Design a protein around this ligand. Structure first.
Ligand code: NI
Lengths: 56, 56, 56
């Protein structure tokens, strides 16, 4: 069981109540108001406002 | 590998063809017509009509 | 931890840059422009244009 990340996509994300950006994370899904990322072994939901998707 | 749940959100869900509600479950994703929940070690997709999302 | 597939749904999917169809895969989620499938132990995101969802 493994969640293959969207190729050529890295995300920097801001956890609630912390201005420091974390990453780079892998993008697993992109919704209307949030995105799913995998930071190493942690998969989290991040509102788009707290995400910086970066193409490659 | 772990799916971190949406904080301050618990869901009660109705499996197809069973009126009894199950839960409380953790909310992992919220779409237009369905929601993703994690009931212990089981992650399932539940139509919004069969879900009771409860904020905290 | 397990991702229960949408019942009565099998998907055939085309990986980017390969015309050969793979499957059958299990449907885990259905979005606006893409779908989430599980091909054995691999969970991938597939644009709807590269997916053949088949009801049962
Ligand atoms: Ni998983």
């Amino acid at each position: 069981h493994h969640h293959h990340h969207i190729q050529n996509f890295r995300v920097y994300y801001r956890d609630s109540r912390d201005p420091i950006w974390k990453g780079p994370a892998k993008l697993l899904w992109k919704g209307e108001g949030a995105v799913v990322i995998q930071d190493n072994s942690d998969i989290k939901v991040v509102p788009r406002r707290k995400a910086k998707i970066i193409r490659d």
